[PDB]
Ligand binder design. Sequence first.
Ligand SMILES: Cc1ccc(O)c(O)c1
Ligand SMILES: Cc1ccc(O)c(O)c1
Ligand SMILES: Cc1ccc(O)c(O)c1
Ligand SMILES: [Fe+3]
Ligand SMILES: [Fe+3]
Ligand SMILES: [Fe+3]
Ligand SMILES: [Fe+3]
Lengths: 296, 288, 288, 296
Amino acid sequence: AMTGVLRPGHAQVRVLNLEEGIHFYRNVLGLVETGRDDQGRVYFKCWDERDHSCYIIREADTAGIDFFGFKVLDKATLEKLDADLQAYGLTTTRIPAGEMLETGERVRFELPSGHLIELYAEKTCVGNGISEVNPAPWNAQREHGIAPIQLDHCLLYGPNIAEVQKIFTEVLGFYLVERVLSPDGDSDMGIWLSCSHKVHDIAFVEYPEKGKLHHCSFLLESWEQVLRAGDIMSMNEVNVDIGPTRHGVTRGCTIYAWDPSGNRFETFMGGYHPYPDYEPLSWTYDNFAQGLDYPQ
Amino acid sequence: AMTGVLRPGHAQVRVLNLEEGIHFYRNVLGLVETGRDDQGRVYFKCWDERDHSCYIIREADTAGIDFFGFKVLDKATLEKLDADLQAYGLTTTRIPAGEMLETGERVRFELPSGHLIELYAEKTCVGNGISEVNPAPWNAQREHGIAPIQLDHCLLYGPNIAEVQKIFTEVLGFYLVERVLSPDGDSDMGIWLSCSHKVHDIAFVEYPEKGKLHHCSFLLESWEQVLRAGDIMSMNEVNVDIGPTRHGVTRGCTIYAWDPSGNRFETFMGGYHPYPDYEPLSWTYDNF
Amino acid sequence: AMTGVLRPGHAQVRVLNLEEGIHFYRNVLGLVETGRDDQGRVYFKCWDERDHSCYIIREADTAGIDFFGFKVLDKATLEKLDADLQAYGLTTTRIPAGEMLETGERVRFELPSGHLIELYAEKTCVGNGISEVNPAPWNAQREHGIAPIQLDHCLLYGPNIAEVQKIFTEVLGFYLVERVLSPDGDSDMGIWLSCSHKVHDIAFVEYPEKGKLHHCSFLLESWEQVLRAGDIMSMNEVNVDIGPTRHGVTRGCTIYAWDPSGNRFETFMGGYHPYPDYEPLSWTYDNF
Amino acid sequence: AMTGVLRPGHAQVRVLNLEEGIHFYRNVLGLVETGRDDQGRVYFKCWDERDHSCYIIREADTAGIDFFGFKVLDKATLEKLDADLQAYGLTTTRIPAGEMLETGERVRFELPSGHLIELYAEKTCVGNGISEVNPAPWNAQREHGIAPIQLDHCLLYGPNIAEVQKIFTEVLGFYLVERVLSPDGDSDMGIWLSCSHKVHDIAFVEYPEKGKLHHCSFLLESWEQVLRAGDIMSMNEVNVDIGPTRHGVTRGCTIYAWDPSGNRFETFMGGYHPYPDYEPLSWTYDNFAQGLDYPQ
Ligand SMILES: Cc1ccc(O)c(O)c1
Ligand SMILES: Cc1ccc(O)c(O)c1
Ligand SMILES: Cc1ccc(O)c(O)c1
Ligand SMILES: [Fe+3]
Ligand SMILES: [Fe+3]
Ligand SMILES: [Fe+3]
Ligand SMILES: [Fe+3]
């Protein structure tokens, strides 16, 4: 069964221009807008998810990520984890229910890497736009812009990855799926963690600066959907970082692009199916180009 | 976190001709053979899996499924589940480690539907043919026969699916992803259960005769892999039940075919990503 | 170089309910409507084609095909073909330009199988909805309903297929790509002809009733588009003959579905690339 | 009907080492070796083609293309074209049958770009290994290495491209499918020519040096087959030039990779279906990069 931390729940990202951020994430990336609160934040979700939101933008003085949240099994689990975080020595903040639209109270804490993490058990279920009886495989939503299927994960850049790993694997019930070994005198330079049987729900890369956001990732259905994402990116003159290709790490096909404010995002699909009983895979530092781009 | 029952671990199926069975599963389905025991059973595993076996075939006078096993997180979980099964009212039998090659002891029990289910926490990890360091996405094994990636599930036909549902959801930690209503006599005629975030790890359909096996299912990479599987079946004179298509339930695109002995198996891919907190989808009997 | 007869130009089919015919062809199949004439006919084209029409519907009492036309290289070629058709022993009737919206004059004749074939060299070019400068690979149109790429061919049922083959290969510059042997009398019960390097531009099957239309066929981009077309059909309660699958007698995937009036159409993709110098492939009747 | 020049027939390429070439083309690219003559040349063909050869390699002190040939309808056609070429003002050479294994006589001539072109009508038909009766869609060969379907075309770099276009369109029966406009003072920097309904059977790009080969291209079945080709290249340490991506021109998906000797080749697929009555599409020079890489 899936217990404890279930999946990435939402990513709060700030854009320089809200208006063009709204247009981009709704008409280009194909996210479904789901509400706009009094703080000027607009909520989005993938057409296929069931919960109210998974991506929220806020016009800030700068770009980047405010926080990244994870939905847990239930309120009992939430309390349970908050307690384990404090027993571990981390200071937690309990954000009240309602602060975020259609969202319940959440437990927020800061990692050694500088990134703020959130844990919540409640968030209104709006459905995926498809009937609950005799549902079709998809609908027009699937063809609106790129239209990804779910917030798959995000990759953060910050210092002390080892400590971050410990909290995730010893406290949040995560486990190492893959790692990038730094130059001889081993220590993990990059770490891919899962709290399920997905290749990863979140990843971290050793970096001197803290609170850095490499990218938030969105799941696609097939390799042909990755191509189409690429075409859509070009049609909208979206700056692409790395064209359509495969990562060795996770074997996940992907494309890196930038949003109007410079926030990098990813549209990918594929990868194997690790379970908690599996041993992590490792990549040598010198061979990290292949782990990043596999064909190339 | 994935805890409790983790995933389908193995299916032991009966074949009327062991020789032809080994031939078909090794060449057509393209499963990797990993061993043969003294009883004459042959062990196979999908190439991308890491454990020693997931599909075992045993010659017999009748086709069908002997039992279906799920792997659990650890020994402590296995012991706990055994007690919950008994506390629930089910009789549990303990299979000694070693009885099945490279497999620890198992907790076996019989469902109201007639099928035998097993739980285990230990089974030797043999890997996926690829190195653990700087691993490649795939190798030649991926193109040997259909070459499915994992045993995905099975569909079992049994009489008391209502009580079966109770056991899987109330004892084993599974949950309802989808169901098929009964002629406005609204009872579930068919249920799809998941113990993870997969569309389903096992499924049952209401049926008068107990112990019936509808099919064991193997996962493929993509829709094009489904087509290739269809081509390979044809080159091998494989009897196909229903050509390549899409199931509304599960949304998975599959192909039903029969093995030489008459056992039906499935090669599919796709499906959404449900989670424990999701409500099940329903299908009207008439729209089945 | 491509010369003589170039490709299937248009197929005019009979629909029992004009309005519902327009709705199916423009919403489900996703063809682009290009005009309506004084006779009540509605014109469509595939989004990616460049000419004004490739598929015309006309309300009638019976479903079926009125005629199938091919576009030829130029006016000179058209004149030459007409003369050669006559010298061969066929009678030709010249239809004036404009008789069909945006269409030049046409050379029409009846095959021994009863079907009416037309040849023309003039058809207004309207574009594929994409700029001619810095053109994108596609646009919204490829996601409007099925959205096929081109009128690929048709399959006609008629008696006297052997004589039909002669006319096409000896007069129209076509060549045999594949054939289906007769039971053992050994003649051809079916033929797939090409006037390019496509697997087939038109095909025929020996059948008692003359002028029978089996289906018109539309080309798709990839195997996934075929799956998609399958889903759109189900969504629209479309009657499907045979679902997504591989042909074999042409090495291309496909779906046979029905028009609301009962006209079968095909959405497929794939196929190898034959050339005039290749020998035809053959199929035994039983294997067919 | 297809008449005149039917399609690309063969490319003879120079490799710096015949051994590394034979292991690479037969095992990595997945071509099928059909013969070897006493002159030290090894013949290859795609598994699905029917003729004896489409790709020939010869060991020399420099990489590059010796010549590119096209197959014509028949003998009469070959004579007609020879006469037309000479009547056009080009001198022609006749290579007797047999000079090349399993090949008939051919007409050779030089273009203003400095490339040697050949025309032939006779070449032994070996088949695709599959039966001619109740043939399967494919066999084990299509899973041998990349295993392309056909020699699709080649891209040649030279000068006097305008003169080259005139020869192919006014003499060899080809037509302009797409072109790349050169900065104001209209002329074409790039040209894609077809002698059938393929997006292109050959192309030329304006360049100083003469006789320069950009690459020979091989057709693949699908987008996923392109991804697989990239995976196989990585697996074989093959240096990749341009990762899996779409074009702009021709809509064709592709991957540019280098052989051991430095010769560039392409694994290609897709594209529309132009016909002789179609007007060519154009790409402005400034947009050339979208020309080569639509998505990025
Ligand atoms: C190296 C890598 C692998 C998989 C990802 O999703 C990603 O963002 C980075
Ligand atoms: C009815 C049904 C739906 C999905 C499946 O995977 C299956 O085996 C049966
Ligand atoms: C017999 C046959 C083979 C291929 C086709 O595309 C078709 O319509 C019919
Ligand atoms: Fe990522
Ligand atoms: Fe199944
Ligand atoms: Fe057809
Ligand atoms: Fe090329």
